[PDB]
Amino acid sequence: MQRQFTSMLQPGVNKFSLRMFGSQKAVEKEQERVKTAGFWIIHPYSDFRFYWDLIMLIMMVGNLVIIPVGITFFTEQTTTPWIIFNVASDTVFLLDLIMNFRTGTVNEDSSEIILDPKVIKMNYLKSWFVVDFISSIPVDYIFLIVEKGRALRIVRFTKILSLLRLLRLSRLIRYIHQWEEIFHMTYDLASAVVRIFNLIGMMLLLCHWDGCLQFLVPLLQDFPPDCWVSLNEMVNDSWGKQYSYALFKAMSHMLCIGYGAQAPVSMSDLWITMLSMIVGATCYAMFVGHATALIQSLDSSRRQYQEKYKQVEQYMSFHKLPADMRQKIHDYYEHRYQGKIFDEENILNELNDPLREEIVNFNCRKLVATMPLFANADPNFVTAMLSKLRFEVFQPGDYIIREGAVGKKMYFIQHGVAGVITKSSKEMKLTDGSYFGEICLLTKGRRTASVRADTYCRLYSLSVDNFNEVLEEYPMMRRAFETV
Amino acid sequence: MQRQFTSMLQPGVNKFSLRMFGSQKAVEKEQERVKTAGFWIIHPYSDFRFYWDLIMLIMMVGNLVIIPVGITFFTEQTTTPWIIFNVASDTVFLLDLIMNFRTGTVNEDSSEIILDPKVIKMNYLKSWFVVDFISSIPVDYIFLIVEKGRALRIVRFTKILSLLRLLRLSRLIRYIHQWEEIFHMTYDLASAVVRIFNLIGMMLLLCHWDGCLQFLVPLLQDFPPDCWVSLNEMVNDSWGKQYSYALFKAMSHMLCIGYGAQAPVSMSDLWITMLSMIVGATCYAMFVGHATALIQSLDSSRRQYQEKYKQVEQYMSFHKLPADMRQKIHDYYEHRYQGKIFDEENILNELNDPLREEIVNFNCRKLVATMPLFANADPNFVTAMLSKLRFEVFQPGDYIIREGAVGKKMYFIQHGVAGVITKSSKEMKLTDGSYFGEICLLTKGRRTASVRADTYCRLYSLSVDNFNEVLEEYPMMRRAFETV
Amino acid sequence: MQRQFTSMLQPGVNKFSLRMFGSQKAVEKEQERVKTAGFWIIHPYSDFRFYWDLIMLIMMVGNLVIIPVGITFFTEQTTTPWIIFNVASDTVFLLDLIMNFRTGTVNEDSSEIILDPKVIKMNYLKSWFVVDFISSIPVDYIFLIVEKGRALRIVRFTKILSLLRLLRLSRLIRYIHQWEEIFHMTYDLASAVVRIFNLIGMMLLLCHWDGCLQFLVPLLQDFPPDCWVSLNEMVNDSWGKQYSYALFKAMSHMLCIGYGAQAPVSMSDLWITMLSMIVGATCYAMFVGHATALIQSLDSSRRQYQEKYKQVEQYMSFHKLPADMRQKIHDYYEHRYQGKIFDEENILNELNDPLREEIVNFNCRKLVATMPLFANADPNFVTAMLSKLRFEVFQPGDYIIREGAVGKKMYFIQHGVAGVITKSSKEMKLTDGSYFGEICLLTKGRRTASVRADTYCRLYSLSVDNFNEVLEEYPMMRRAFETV
Amino acid sequence: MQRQFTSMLQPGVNKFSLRMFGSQKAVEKEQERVKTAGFWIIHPYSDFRFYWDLIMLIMMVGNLVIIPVGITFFTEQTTTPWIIFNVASDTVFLLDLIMNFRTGTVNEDSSEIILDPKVIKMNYLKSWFVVDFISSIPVDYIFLIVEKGRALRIVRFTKILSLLRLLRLSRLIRYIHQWEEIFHMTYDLASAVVRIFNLIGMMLLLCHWDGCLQFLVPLLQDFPPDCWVSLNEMVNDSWGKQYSYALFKAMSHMLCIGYGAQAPVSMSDLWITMLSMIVGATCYAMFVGHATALIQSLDSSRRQYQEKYKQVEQYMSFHKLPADMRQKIHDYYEHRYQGKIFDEENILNELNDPLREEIVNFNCRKLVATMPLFANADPNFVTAMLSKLRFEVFQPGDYIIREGAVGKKMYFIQHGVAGVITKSSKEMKLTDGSYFGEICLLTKGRRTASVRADTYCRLYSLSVDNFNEVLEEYPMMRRAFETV
């Protein structure tokens, strides 16, 4: 039906498109744009473009594996079950050429799909059409039709012409990069994990193509007595035995290992070996690079924590701090950050208000709801108050509050025991969920009892500067607390 | 005794657990949670889980080394001293299967142990039970009992079935990663040093397994005349000579070196060689990646210092500063930072108050205690004052204070000689521990003598803005200094 | 003509020079400086220096490829068509020696061209003249003229003397680094892409030189029976067959692959092999390093985004946030940043005012021009206002404004639907380009209706603190809005 | 003389020591500390310790190269010219053992030299004395004296005992790391360049030791017919031919290349080959890691600039900015930063006042000295003023000032032409060194003429907020400018 047929060629309302265009109305604006052409635009983000590129990737990985092998290890590439594969697949890759004249293009420099037919055709014919046409049209069977209008020379030249189909790797690279830019925008794949699998796919393909080339150059020379295929006496081995050996040569030049049974004798086998070493050791260097980037991404937060701590050790050693105090600072960072690197002030500034308020109310509303100041207060005021709490960790023996010091802030216990070392009583061990220093906010005096950490206290603290900064926003609660 | 027996299965009060749950009361809350099941939960952080996984790791590293070798290089894996090892160890790995149906699970996405028996069993049977059961139960001896209900075919198939025990590597990977996540939370091991030793352990194991596989595939084919074992004439060498050669092949494919005495002749030896090259050169790329991450972590602070300084050189060169002044800025950074990278303002903001106050009193109380302003003052006031000191380094010939300039700050000497170049006297060389500019805080006038660095002075400075900011916090001392 | 001839030797008015000196008048000041010498200065940035170094690079890459080969694989380097190349090229490299005595020098430590003839000559004769003179003057043909004033010993020693021409690689390294420092300042090439192509060029050259050396040391020994050239029976193969094999040896020692057909027999072939392995595996390690740096530069922004997000996951897990809220924070970062890392506050502070104002007016003037407050206002006021807008993203179900809350800021919709959930009406779905909370700026009251995100809203927000901060700058508009 | 003899053992007054202790008085305090012991302390930073470790490093690199070779490739290590080297060198390494009982120790955890004799002896005997004593005392000649109190077994065992001298590598590692920690604190060597040369030195040594070991294990077995030395028929080749081959084996296992002429036949040669591959490929992985760290340090500032710019491209693409404006922002960053990364605000905050003032007066005093406001003002006031200048770059066509806009800041031209596009006159092209907007500071009105960039202006700007902030510091100049 024509409505569903047109619907496939437009950018759909889906998790990607509503994130790329930012609203379902901006998606509809782009659909209403695509409706300008006489079906002569399919959008780069359309379901048609997706499923077409998906069947093109499985078509093209299959074809870029099968074509090197059928051109290299098989006689009679003019046979019915082989020309049926090549005419069918070159039809699919010619439909794909026609589709790219009507396919838009994602202009990264303007963040817009070009999406107009004369602009798409003129940019495409200037960008990639020559490699796409050469790799699309059956130039090998065209040359057989011209030559039928010498047999060993025709079978030589048609094998080189048939490897112009390998320029489908330009489309494989392109359609993979387009669909991976789209899939990062859909699934947040780790960059180095996408990149290592691009390169593992490229290594396997270039290793496979070198594996074919290592036999093809012997074959195009009619297996001279000084090439490895003749020296290994395997010019008449099965296509699979030959391919396995030829691949093993290429793979040994790739993965940095060796040769076949001998160093190359003939100058063409020697130069194809050097090319395959250059391509191979380039791939393996590129793969050690991607493996390194993968590894450095996978522990990146732990690596950044230990880099940050090493700057604490550099601070400690610059100031020549005693080993007893350096151990105290180490044990502080171990309890304050738990080996995790973040900036709370940075991250909370990157969030919206509702999401700060949800994070803050999950962390701190359980601590504050026990306090008689806040158990009876308005939910909007308490939500504004909890955002002013500063998290503090006190190691055992640290005085959180000292008797006779000015009451600049008051505290709440998330975890640990804090002993109220009062001037005329036994030490009341305030356990997790307790609160203290509360007379600082109401009375503006010096503290009436010291409070010291009896374990590694994890505290939330409320400065009287920040308390008053929030009470200026809620004068109804200010007049209420002023009653007591 | 039942109390001690139950006590092992709960999360203990230890350096890890009191840091993971954050308080001894939150540990007790988790112990009181674990008491819900009828012994049918042991906690993922329990001493039982630890010592069970510890004896499982030494059991499993031993077993994953011994099983490949006994299946590959030995005849008669049905013999008494071999079935005793396999029935005993498969009992231990079946107790371990049963233990995982009652073992909780650390849910990283919620930072909670799942710790309920129907939730643990349903998540486990959906996650890992198939690989754990196949690797637990003696499928090789089960197949011998079924087959006893052809001998060369049975001895072929039972060796492949017996390598289903190698799926204990899933448990080895898991129990190592669990105990290393726990040990980072206990000992702060360097991330890349833990990771390099995971991979060195994995390389040795995969090299050992490839070493076995390289002989096993020849053996399962009954040593055909075109495999390396037959070509090396070593089908009847000792198990140790065979293992050493087979390992050397695998290790040469791993560490990027070569083959045995020849490139592979038979297609199965050729493909097991290609598999071992792919696995091997993958491992070595992963190991160059981890070696690089280890190296970049080990000098990370020096690397970050020289990156920061290179931005000072980029600033100097952007501004086209004279080489004489660039050398002056270099010698300044050399004395100001001593090649150490830190941010004092960032690090002091990450600490608690008691730990800032201890660091500050260690650095600066020796400098300030000589001053007549502070030798007679209250310890709380001086501790508040010392935090306002800013560290400054003056190179020789730098005027710290100029005669007739406004007295915006006053100084204390940590190190170096600063000459008071007075307008009517000889230059009094103020040595380390001296102080100057002190009339700025009391008198609010322009300076009565210039002071210039005669060496690389390291100074602490007290702005009169920050002095007054601290005196507003201690009006009793403000009225006292106002007396003189 | 003398004016055009002098004009080539001065720093031109071009995209590089007007950026290096910063103005066409500072370029003219440097041209007027260069006019001090009697043509005895050509400037390091001059068109003469450029085109001279350009023809010197193509001369020198050609010569450093051709000289090793003609000295190694050819007899009779005293022949007419070979001495014509060497006398012509050594003339060009002697003109280049003379040009460097009159060429200035870019002093990186002062960001100034030294550009005075006695200072240039005295610095050059102290820096590089010995390597440049030895590589310039035909020391090989000088020695033949002295020796004509024994033939196998003369043909030995003249080949070693002729490889003193390979010290032109010092000039190749220098002129490449000078022109790449200039080209970074002209085209912003990716650092690692310039560096990888330096090293690929250096690898190809050192592989080529090792390839020559591997044959040259056999040749200088008159091909002893224990060197690879004699063992391969190829002392009489064509120069191209020999070069291809000798290169293949060197390339296999470089790219970590193997040897020739045998491990080296004679001690000189063995030590040249060890030298070529040390040089080769040094190059390949340097190339894996540059490949890694290239890869880590190419995905650097995605890598930095996933590092930043992993710190959000570390924050979430430190605070033990529920998996439901962690997913909410993930979906927030996905819509707030779209996988892109930047700091808007940092980047806008790095720009000038006109460029902030152009970026801000492109982003926000389409959103504000619908509002009745701003459709009728002055372009300078609106441009000042739009800079105070803060971008906020609200996930579906997030209340942007709550009824009865204080109106601290008002909003504009870039994208998404926000429902006005009014206390006495149906939910008016405000679509993209709408605005709400507008009574907050005029009336200073609590909000009269709640507004909640019905999709992922992308909003611009205007705090009443920042609105009043901008209206203090435009009192004419302040008195106008005070009318309504 | 006893004063000079004692003087060598104390920490001298030198560029390192005056930077490590921070003052010549703190150096004297450490010298006065060292005077506590009865010559039984030499300080870890002393000239004696330096020159002793310097002659120990050249002694020890020589010895750790010569001992493997003399034990491996030479008969009769009991001969006069060999026992003279070993008794002399083992005397030097026994004096060094005695020196370490009186040598202090740099405690990195407290940044103090331990420098007391019972504390030094007790820490040393617990830390390194066992490896130092075993490697110091002639255990090989002790065993010959005991055995003289069987000849092939004695010559076997004495070679293994003599390689206990190779535990001098513990001292080589230690004394290199101590002197490189001291030399970073003296010369600011690039971290990765020091580290790559540690590892190149370690690779050469381990390659040399493997090269010896590869022959030594054959020799200790009396050259069995299945080891490479016997298969290569070279048990009677010269020591140099054997060493060159044995080294080549080890070096090929190190640099990832191959074997000797064959894969190993005997199980001991096979296992020494596997050990040498494990050690070798570990070294090469460690060396690719250090090469990568060296490369990533060498372009680190350019890499950081292109990372920062890529965040500007991520900002531009997140905001979907037009390609015309993205090019404008690119050309802005190219002129604003010139491809150089720094933070001016960060770097100027890290400096002292005199060095900020020197940098600022070099940059800006030439620009301000033309202005009639500042040509007649006091040097202290102008130096305070120039620090308030903010550098701004305006691209051509950018309006710096607009007619009728409020005069919030005034400008000075460092470079470029800015046209005063006056409302009633021809465009006065203000060239480099001019100033404009000057009526903003005196008159507080809207601008009387627009000023637009006619080239890429580089400007210094003075906000009237910052002008008034500086004039509050100099009321004498405030009352003077108030006269006009």
Task: Return all residues near B297 (Cβ < 8 A) that are at least 6 apart.
Answer: A303, A306, A307, B190, B191, B192, B193
The structure tokens 């942007």 sit at C400
Any domain includes C18: yes
Q: What is the DSSP string of C408-463?
A: -EEEEEEES-EEEEETTS--EEE-TT-EE-THHHHH--B-SEEEEESS-EEEEEEE
| The residue type at B464 | V
* In a shared domain, residues A326 and A389: no
The answer to whether the annotation marks D364 as part of a ligand binding site is no
Domain that holds residue A325: 301-337
Q: Letter for the amino acid at B425?
A: S
Resolution limit in angstroms? Answer: 3.0
Q: Are D361 and D470 contained in the same domain? A: yes
- Cβ-Cβ contacts under 8 Å, C280 against chain D: 255
Inter-chain CB proximity B320 and C112 less than 8 Å: yes
Q: Which of A109, A112, A100, A107 is nearest to A20 (CA)?
A: A112
- Is B448 annotated among the ligand-binding residues? yes
Chain A touching partners, 3 or more CB pairs below 8 A? B, C, D
Question: What's the CA gap between A340 and B297, in Å, rounded?
Answer: 16
Rounded Cα–Cα distance for residues B140 and C174 (Å): 69
**Is D147 a known ligand-binding residue?**
no
Residues of C in contact with B317 (CB under 8 A): 108, 111
CB A285 within 8 A of CB C287: yes
**Residue A120 to residues A53, A104, A117, D424, Cα–Cα distance (Å):** 18, 6, 5, 49
CA A285 to each of CA A293, C302, D379: distance values in angstroms, whole numbers, following the listed order: 12, 21, 60
d(CA A69, CA A239): 9
Residue C196: C-alpha distances to residues B382, C190, D292 (Å): 58, 10, 12
- Please indicate, yes or no, whether residues C148 and C57 belong to a single structural domain of this protein: yes
- Across the interface, whether the CB atoms of C256 and B256 are under 8 A apart is answered yes
D277 — contact with chain B (CB < 8 Å)? yes
Of A110, A258, A323, the CB nearest to D322: A110
- Which chain D positions have a beta carbon within 8 Å of C297's beta carbon? 303, 306-307
The packing angle between helices C80-100 and C129-136, to 10°, is 160
Alpha-carbon span A416 to B19, nearest angstrom: 11
Residue D368 sits in a domain of what CATH number?
2.60.120.10
- Identify whether residues D259 and D404 lie together within a single domain: no
Q: Which residue of C has its CA nearest to D313?
A: C342
Q: Is D438 helix (H, G, I), strand (E, B) or coil?
A: coil
How many helices and strands, by DSSP H and E, does chain B display?
Answer: 22, 10
In DSSP terms, which residues pair with D458 in a beta bridge? D393, D415
Cα(A295)–Cα(B195) distance, rounded to whole angstroms? Answer: 9
Cβ A258–D258 below 8 Å, yes or no? yes
The DSSP bridge partners found for residue A463 are A409
Residue with tokens 């991404």: A297
Q: Are residues B9 and B63 in the same domain?
A: yes
Q: Which long-range contacts (CB under 8 A, 24 or more apart) does D238-241 make?
A: D239/D69, D239/D73, D239/D74, D240/C267, D241/C267
B317 touches chain A (CB under 8 A): no
Per the structure block, which two tokens stand in for D329? 């922002």
Strand partners, B450: B421
Among D458, D287, D463, D67, which Cα is nearest to C23's? D458
CA distance A131 to A167: 6
Contact C296 D296 (CB under 8 A): yes
The pairing of strands A409-415 and A435-436 is antiparallel
Give the torsion sign (CA, B246, A252, C199, B311).
negative
Q: How many helices, marked H, and strands, marked E, lie in chain A?
A: 22, 10
Residue B21 counted as domain residue = yes
Distance CA C467, CA C464 (A): 5
| Secondary structure of A317-331 in HEC code, one letter for each residue | HHCCCCHHHHHHHHH
Is some CB atom of chain A closer than 8 A to the CB atom of C322?
Answer: yes
In this structure, what DSSP letter does residue A246 have? Answer: H
For residue D450, count other CB atoms closer than 10 A to its CB: 18
Which of D283, D298, D313 is a domain's end point? D298
Q: Closest Cα partner for A94 from A141, A129, A140, A48?
A: A129
Q: Which of A155, A133, A9, A176 is nearest to A72 (CA)?
A: A155
Residue contact D258–B258, C-beta within 8 A: yes
Dihedral angle computed from the Cα positions of residues C123, C125, C127 and C132, in that order, rounded to the nearest 10 degrees: 140
Cα separation of B392 and D353, whole Å? 9
CB C314 within 8 A of CB C361: no
CA distance D146 to chain B (A): 37
CA closest to D109 among chain A residues: A323
Q: Does residue A406 contact residue A463 with C-beta atoms inside 8 Å?
A: no
- B256/C111 Cβ within 8 A: no
Residue D81 lies in a domain: yes
Residue numbers followed by a gap, chain D, C–N over 2.5 Å: 149
Is residue C129 within 8 Å of residue C154, measured between CB atoms? no
- Verify whether the Cβ–Cβ distance D458 to C23 is below 8 Å: yes
Q: Are residues B305 and B380 in the same domain?
A: no
What tokens does B434 get? 């001296």
B438 and B311 within one domain: no
Instruction: Tell me which long-range contacts B60-64 makes (C-beta under 8 A, separation of at least 24).
Output: B60/B93, B60/B168, B60/B171, B60/B172, B60/B175, B61/B172, B61/B201, B63/B89, B63/B93, B63/B165, B63/B168, B64/B165, B64/B166, B64/B168, B64/B169, B64/B172, B64/B205
Q: Which of A131, A164, A179 is the last residue of a domain?
A: A179
Say if CB B430 and CB B459 are below 8 A apart.
no
Which residue of A lies nearest to D259 if distances are taken between CA atoms? A258
State the nearest Cα–Cα gap between C27 and chain B, in angstroms.
15
Are B315 and B456 in a shared domain?
no
Residue of B nearest to A413 (CA): B23
Q: Could you give the 3-state DSSP secondary structure of residue B426?
A: coil
Residue C93 lies in a domain: yes
Contact B109 C288 (CB under 8 A): no
Name the strand (E) or helix (H) holding D453: strand D449-453
Residue C251 CB burial class (10 angstroms; 0-12, 13-18, ≥19): buried
DSSP state of A418: E
Query: CATH number for the domain including D232?
Result: 1.10.287
H helices within C10-150, ranges in order? Answer: 17-20, 24-34, 47-72, 80-100, 117-127, 129-136, 139-147
Tell me the shortest Cα–Cα distance from C57 to chain B, in angstroms: 28
Longest CA–CA separation in chain B, Å? 116
DSSP per residue over A187-232, as a string? H---HHHHHHHHHHHHHHHHHHHHHHHHHHHHHHTT--TTSHHHHT
8 Å CB contact of A109 and D323: yes
Give how far the C-alpha of residue B20 lies from the chain's centroid of Cα atoms, to the nearest Å. 17
> For residues C436 and C421, what is the distance between their CA atoms, to the nearest angstrom?
12
In a domain, D123, yes or no: yes
Residue A38 amino acid letter: G
Question: Rounded CA gap, D251 and D208, in Å?
Answer: 8
Helix (H, G, I), strand (E, B) or coil at D407: coil
Residues facing A451 on adjacent strands: A401, A420
B252 touches chain C (CB under 8 A): no
In whole angstroms, give the CA distance from residue A69 to residue A240: 10
Closest listed residue to residue D226, CA positions, set D252, D258, D263, D257: D263
CA-based nearest residue to A22, from D53, D320, B72, D307: D320
Place of tokens 């912003």: C188
On chain D, the residues whose CB falls within 8 A of the CB of B259 are: 263
User: Is B244–D270 a contact, with Cβ atoms under 8 angstroms apart?
Assistant: yes
D472 CB-contact burial (10 Å; exposed 0-12 / middle 13-18 / buried 19+):
exposed
A37 with A95, same domain: the answer is yes
The answer to whether residue A317 neighbours chain D at the CB level (below 8 Å) is yes
Q: Is the same domain home to B441 and B327?
A: no
Assigned token pair, B353: 């108050």
Identify which of C255, C302, C398 has the shortest CB distance to residue A191.
C302
Interface test with A, best of C252, C262, C294, C295 (most A CBs within 10 A): C295
Please give the structure tokens belonging to residue C179: 């022109």
Cβ-contact A42, A102 below 8 angstroms: yes
- Distance of alpha carbon D443 from alpha carbon C189, whole angstroms: 48
Asked whether residue D374 is assigned to any structural domain, the reply reads yes
State in Å, rounded, how far the first CA of chain C is from the last one: 76
By CB atoms closer than 10 A (0-12, 13-18, 19+), residue D73 is: buried
State whether residue B412 is helix, strand or coil: strand
Q: Tell me which amino acid residue D222 is.
A: D
Tell whether D397 is in a known binding site.
no
Residue in D253, D296, D347 nearest the CB of B257: D253
- Go through B373-401 and write b for each residue having 16 or more CB atoms within 10 A of its CB, e for each that does not: bbeebeebbbbbbbbbbeebbbbeebbbb
Closest CA to C432 of B138, A28, D468, B147: A28
Q: Select from A23, A192, A353 the Cβ nearest to the Cβ of C455.
A: A23
CA distance B125 to B136: 14
**Interchain contact B388–D (C-beta under 8 A):** no
Distance from CA of C290 to the nearest CA of B (A): 13
Going B69 to B70 to B74 to B75, the CA torsion angle's sign is negative
CB contact under 8 A, C267 and D240: yes
Establish if D351 belongs to a structural domain.
no
Q: Please check whether residues A324 and A463 belong to one and the same domain.
A: no
Contact criterion met (CB < 8 Å) for A322 and D110: yes
Distance from CA of A445 to the nearest CA of D (A): 36
A225 lies in a domain? no
Q: Is C76 annotated as a binding residue?
A: no
For the sheet containing A399-401, what is the strand order? A399-401, A449-453, A418-422, A428-430
Look at C329 and A343 and tell me if their CB atoms are within 8 Å. Answer: no
Residues of C in contact with D294 (CB under 8 A): 289
Q: How was this structure determined?
A: cryo-EM
Query: Distance (Å, rounded) from C-alpha C15 to C-alpha C21?
Result: 10
Q: Are residues B117 and B221 in the same domain?
A: yes
Chain mean position to CA A130: 32
Residue C228 CA to residue C28 CA, distance in Å, equals 62
Report chain C's C-alpha Rg in angstroms: 36
Nearest neighbour of C288 by CB, restricted to B112, B288, B326:
B288
Q: Is A110 on the interface with D (CB under 8 A)?
A: yes
Decide: residue A138, CB within 10 A, 0-12 exposed, 13-18 middle, 19+ buried.
Answer: buried
C-alpha distances (whole Å) from C204 to each of A284, C160, C284, D434 are 17, 21, 11, 53
Provide, as residue numbers in chain A, all residues whose Cβ is less than 8 Å from the Cβ of C314. 301, 305, 340-342
Among A125, A155, A179, the domain-final residue is: A179
Whole-number Å distance between alpha carbons of A19 and A24: 9
Query: Are residues D444 and D404 in contact, defined by beta-carbon separation less than 8 angstroms?
Result: no
Residues of D in contact with C470 (CB under 8 A): none
Pairing assessment for the beta strands C399-401 and C428-430 based on DSSP bridges:
unpaired
**Number of structural domains chain B divides into:** 3
Determine the straight-line distance between the first and last CA of chain A, rounded to whole angstroms. Answer: 76
C431 and A CB contact within 8 Å:
yes
The number of beta carbons lying within 10 Å of the beta carbon of residue D173 is 12
Q: Do D321 and C289 touch (CB under 8 A)?
A: no
SS3 D235: coil
